[PDB]
Design a protein around this nucleic acid. Structure first.
Length: 63
DNA sequence: TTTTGGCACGTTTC
DNA sequence: GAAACGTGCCAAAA
């Protein structure tokens, strides 16, 4: 929690668009991996961020 | 089924 | 007086 100007912003799209665009993550799953490396942001925040950056859900982009 | 939006609180500083 | 940041549950939407 209590991150910078975008320590979870400039990261949610920089890993998800690099892994498996044919098998996307979710606001829970991205919130989880971000706790393993230094962000420890919850799903409530990360949801509001993939909204503001530019992602509709990535499920709807993939399917 | 899965993924996600609206409402409210904690914190600190102005 | 108020903002800003992440964050707790609820139900809504595909």
């Amino acid at each position: 929690h209590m991150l910078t100007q975008g320590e979870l912003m400039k990261l949610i799209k920089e890993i998800v668009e690099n892994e498996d665009k044919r098998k996307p993550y979710s606001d829970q799953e991205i919130a989880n991996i971000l706790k393993e490396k230094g962000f420890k942001v919850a799903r409530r925040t990360v949801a509001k961020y993939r909204e503001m950056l530019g992602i509709p859900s990535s499920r709807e982009r993939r399917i």
